[PDB]
Design a protein around this ligand. Structure first.
Ligand code: HEM
Length: 82
């Protein structure tokens, strides 16, 4: 099932490669995706250990990309956080 994770859990996943971020409470495991992503690694890693809902939704991307994104959900905001 979804691995319920607090901001903390993501905040801990932020290293040179080790990259997690949040896109509407849902935690996206982009550590692999860095190298796949047409928008590169740097950006995602910079957003790492935080809610990048902002950056995804503000960049806007594409329906397809919005829907591709789901494949990287590992977790979601702790029921106290959420
Ligand atoms: C987790 C969801 C993500 C997925 C699956 C994803 C997917 C993609 C895809 C498919 C593109 C190509 C353009 C398009 O068709 O939309 C793209 C471009 C891009 N992405 Fe992402 N992305 C994700 C998250 C992010 C985040 C959080 C950032 C910001 C740190 C970001 C920054 C960019 C940038 C700057 C581009 C380049 C736009 C251009 O072509 O000028 N993406 N992404």
């Amino acid at each position: 099932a979804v691995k319920y994770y607090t901001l903390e859990e993501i905040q801990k996943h932020n290293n040179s490669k080790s990259t997690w971020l949040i896109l509407h409470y849902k935690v996206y495991d982009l550590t692999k995706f860095l190298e796949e992503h047409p928008g590169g690694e740097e950006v995602l890693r910079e957003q790492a250990g935080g809610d990048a809902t902002e950056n995804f939704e503000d960049v806007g991307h594409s329906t397809d990309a919005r829907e591709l994104s789901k494949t990287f959900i590992i977790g979601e905001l702790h029921p106290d956080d959420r």
